[PDB]
């Protein structure tokens, strides 16, 4: 306990300094919180993540199956980043965004830089010429698996998308780093031997059960679990709804990060802030804090407060 703690500190921080903050963690550490974030939509994902949104100068990944959230959890970020004045590129292997969904989450698709690259080796040569610059504060690549290598599309071996990647990520990862630019990379359930080493946070996202509206689908329960975070301690995990064509209820965040937080008292079917009723059942709580945006940011302020931030 006197004598091993001081040599354990020792160890951990020469460890650090040989490798980095964050290259070791007790899992119930506080995280360090950065000047600026990206938010990610969600102030429950946001608080899994530590750091209160995905950090700067990093490479993310963003993995699950199809139509599993990942994109709309990317587009976001996109939105968040433009919304503080930022500037945002979309590298696109895949062909399948939608701007009127983008459009209805926050995202400025006017302003948003697209690229629909030839190749592989393309698609990562545009995103480095992007990051160099310093203008971009986020790039995202959609996606890991649709990178193919030259060779492939010109018909001529085998493990070659792979070394393509890992030459790619080693030369942006300074670049990102002096730039303060983040990068997403989507990915499928595949190339990422390289990304999952070189990303500073892994993203679980899968849907967990479809939300009902009577009868018909209004969305989708999401479920995220960071799998790697070197910004703070990892494994946490969140969940959050995304609402057909309007995107993650931030609302609907709000309440269940509230509750738990026992910032939002729950009398029965009625949640309840600060003396008064928000709604009985959860979409009045969740229709009454986007109706009430003054409340609906009261509470956000409270739940940061409450935390790191």
Excluded at 73 to 95: K, M, P, R, T
Excluded at 140 to 169: K, N, T, Y
Aim: charged content about 25%; proline content about 3%.
């Amino acid at each position: 306990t006197p004598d091993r703690e001081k040599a354990l500190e020792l160890a951990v921080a020469q460890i650090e300094k040989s490798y980095g903050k964050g290259s070791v963690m007790r899992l119930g550490d506080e995280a360090r919180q950065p000047i600026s974030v990206i938010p990610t939509g969600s102030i429950a994902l946001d608080v899994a993540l530590g750091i209160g949104g995905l950090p700067r100068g990093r490479v993310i990944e963003i993995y699950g199956p199809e139509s599993s959230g990942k994109t709309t959890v990317a587009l976001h970020a996109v939105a968040n980043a433009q919304a503080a004045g930022g500037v945002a590129a979309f590298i696109d292997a895949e062909h399948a965004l939608d701007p009127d969904y983008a459009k209805k989450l926050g995202v400025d698709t006017d302003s948003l830089l697209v690229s629909q690259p030839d190749t592989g080796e393309q698609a990562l040569e545009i995103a480095d010429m992007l990051i160099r610059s310093g203008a971009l504060d986020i790039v995202v690549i959609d996606s890991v698996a649709a990178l193919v290598p030259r060779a492939e599309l010109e018909g001529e071996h085998v493990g070659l998308q792979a070394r393509l990647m890992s030459q790619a990520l080693r030369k942006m990862t300074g670049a990102l780093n002096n730039s303060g630019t983040t990068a997403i990379f989507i990915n499928q359930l595949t190339g990422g031997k390289a990304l999952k080493f070189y990303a500073s946070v892994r993203m679980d996202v899968r849907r967990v059960e479809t939300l009902k509206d009577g009868t018909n689908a209004v969305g989708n329960r999401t479920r995220v679990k960071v799998v790697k975070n070197k910004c703070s301690p990892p494994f946490k995990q969140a969940e959050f709804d995304i609402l057909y064509g309007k995107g993650i209820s931030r609302e609907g965040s709000l309440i269940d990060m509230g509750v738990d937080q026992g910032l939002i008292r729950k009398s029965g079917a009625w949640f309840t802030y600060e003396g008064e009723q928000l709604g009985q059942g959860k979409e009045n709580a969740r229709n009454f804090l986007v109706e009430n945006a003054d409340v609906a940011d009261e509470i956000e302020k409270k739940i940061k407060e409450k935390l790191g931030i």
